[PDB]
Amino acid sequence: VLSPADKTNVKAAWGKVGAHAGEYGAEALERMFLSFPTTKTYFPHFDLSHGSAQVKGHGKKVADALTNAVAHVDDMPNALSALSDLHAHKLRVDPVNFKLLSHCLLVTLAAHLPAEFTPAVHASLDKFLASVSTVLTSKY
Amino acid sequence: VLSPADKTNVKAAWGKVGAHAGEYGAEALERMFLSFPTTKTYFPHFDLSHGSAQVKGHGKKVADALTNAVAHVDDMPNALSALSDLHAHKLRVDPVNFKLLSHCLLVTLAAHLPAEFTPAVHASLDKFLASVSTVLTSKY
Amino acid sequence: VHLTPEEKSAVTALWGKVNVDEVGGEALGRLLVVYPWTQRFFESFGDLSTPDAVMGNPKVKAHGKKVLGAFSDGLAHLDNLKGTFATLSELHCDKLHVDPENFRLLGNVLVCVLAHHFGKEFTPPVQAAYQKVVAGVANALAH
Amino acid sequence: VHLTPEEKSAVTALWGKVNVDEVGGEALGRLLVVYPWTQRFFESFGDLSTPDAVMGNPKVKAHGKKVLGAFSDGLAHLDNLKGTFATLSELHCDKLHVDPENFRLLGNVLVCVLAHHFGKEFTPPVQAAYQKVVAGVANALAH
Ligand code: HEM
Ligand code: HEM
Ligand code: HEM
Ligand code: HEM
């Protein structure tokens, strides 16, 4: 369950993120690769260096998925069903990695929106990303 | 997010548990107290010795809650709402403790139903207990 | 792993009645069934689609035999777990890239397998002693 | 915790610009807000109902300064984390009964607080170095 006040905070935070979402997604992925190198094993065919166009495009995709999740916060489980099938049935991603990516997304958001990252917004974003991770790890 | 097959598995396993539910819950609580003594800090007023009537009554209550969850598997979040409020808002229980109690319940079920504890039933019961813990750790 | 003399005596006595070929394969197979993301590591072994295919896989059985042999070796050296589990820690970290949480999951699955095999003989004190040994082996492997 | 010379130099330089009184209270208050079950250990601090009350609590501020002082002491002794945190580990385990996962939660909250304070200066390499120091402090406290 996501609170209506937490829901409003997430929409304002992501709306303020705005057009910088693809860069923020690519920077979050770079942070995850740098701090948790075990996550690089899921991208063996990728160029994971700094400024990599492959990581930039993947970060754009992840940011677009998060934007769609924000737009469909009421119906994420079926708004993210293909992503759930890909991540659970095909990729077989450990849920700890979802936790790590959520943390790195939060760190990027903190570093890029100082005024917007109040403690209430921080808690709202933490629980929104936890709900997204739950949906993506749900196997059905 | 459970399936009809594992729902049938859970219903059959708990039906075979039957009238031993309170005894099994007391045994699981005793196992949790012995194996993870940090969980005893939530029961400072209890007598947590072996054969304790207080632990026996609490195990009966927990088993009845699990029986109600099995009987209302399709509407657990509103079947366990008072328990969610109690555990989250009032008791403030760490979700790691919910994981520990689910493990000890599984161990008791394995030790008491050898034939019933097939790998499929084991996975179904793990998913059901994870669903119960998820409901009880949700703040509204 | 520090254990009381009674805890160590109980742990060793239950271990003597363990069947090495059957128990480890059952724990590995139950890990693969209950936590399906762990099959990423075991893709080479073969068909792992259904639980019946997982539990009837000779590669899974043989690897479980190896894993339970490692568990027995750790049990025989309970005061030097970080020392006996150093090469395996290097293997599981540097080359396999297995998360340390999966070691704890496998240890809990092994505890459930022991309970399922031994029934009422798997008393809560025996379970507590075995949980401490399983946590120590997981910590040693996660180093 | 083993760090490269560049990593150690970067960690120390960012740490020098940390305000000890403000940062620790912000991390403790954000922990209490984001993970509300942690207020069970601080119910003696007074009012913790709303986030605004949590972040405006002098007891939370003063305790956070002690927690950051401990973090600084650990940072000055990165090669002996298990030794500098022995007394604190005993205190947090035997009398307070705090789960080790909460130490990792607090470390991640501190990393977020550092990112919020330093902005673009908190580069991904600096974040990786601080992640390792935070994990080492959490592991040392969990022993
Ligand atoms: C937490 C939120 C996440 C979101 C919103 C997300 C979103 C996405 C999207 C949109 C795609 C592209 C799918 C397509 O184009 O059809 C994708 C692919 C992928 N994701 Fe995620 N993902 C998340 C978490 C993770 C994590 C934590 C990992 C691994 C540690 C991961 C690993 C992958 C991989 C390996 C691919 C395949 C990309 C390729 O092979 O080209 N994802 N994800
Ligand atoms: C499947 C998991 C659980 C179930 C079904 C469950 C069920 C219950 C029930 C039915 C009650 C009595 C409520 C009432 O009579 O109004 C209760 C109370 C309580 N539970 Fe749980 N519980 C679970 C998990 C846990 C865990 C993991 C802990 C702590 C480690 C815990 C700690 C408590 C405490 C402290 C009480 C208050 C009892 C008292 O003070 O008399 N519960 N629970
Ligand atoms: C306490 C936990 C564990 C112990 C004691 C253990 C022990 C072992 C042993 C003895 C080997 C054989 C080493 C060799 O043949 O040189 C091995 C290999 C391996 N382990 Fe584990 N293991 C544990 C947990 C895990 C977990 C949880 C996973 C995956 C989720 C895993 C994945 C693997 C893989 C993929 C191999 C190599 C198998 C192959 O390449 O065919 N291990 N482990
Ligand atoms: C993760 C790294 C942590 C560090 C470095 C740290 C540091 C400290 C220090 C230095 C003290 C000494 C206070 C005194 O002696 O008066 C203390 C006390 C305390 N810590 Fe922590 N702490 C950490 C994590 C946590 C967490 C995660 C919690 C709870 C969820 C916690 C709960 C407490 C409590 C309740 C006290 C006693 C405060 C009181 O009784 O008023 N600590 N800690």
Residue numbers in the entry:
A (entry chain A), B (entry chain C): 1 to 140
C (entry chain D), D (entry chain B): 1 to 143
Copy out sentences from the published article reporting this entry, exactly as the authors wrote them.
Here, we present a workflow that utilizes the SPT Labtech chameleon – a next-generation nanospray cryoEM grid preparation device – in an aerobic environment to freeze O2-sensitive proteins under functionally anaerobic conditions, which we term (an)aerobic. Demonstrating the utility of this workflow, we determined high-resolution cryoEM structures of deoxygenated human hemoglobin (Hb) in various liganded states and the molybdenum-iron protein (MoFeP) – the O2-sensitive catalytic component of Azotobacter vinelandii nitrogenase – in a reduced state. Finally, we detail the effects of O2 contamination at different stages of the workflow and show how to prevent their effects. Together, we demonstrate reproducible high-resolution structure determination of O2-sensitive proteins of varying complexity and size – as small as 64 kDa – with a workflow requiring only minimal modifications to a robust, widely available EM grid freezing method.
We prepared deoxyHb in the same manner described above in PBS supplemented with 60 mM NaDT in the final buffer and prepared cryoEM grids using identical conditions as the mixed-O2 species. We collected a dataset of similar size and determined the structure Hb to a resolution of 2.75-Å. This lack of density indicates that no observable O₂ is bound to the hemes. D 2.75-Å resolution cryoEM structure of deoxyHb under 60 mM NaDT. We also compared the densities above each heme in our Hb structures to recently published cryoEM maps of both deoxy and oxy human Hb, as well as to two structures of Hb determined using X-ray crystallography, further confirming the ligand states of each of our structures. Together, these structures indicate that, in combination, the protective oil layer, minimized sample wicking times, and appropriate [NaDT] are sufficient to maintain deoxyHb until structure determination and, therefore, create sufficiently reducing conditions for O2-sensitive samples.
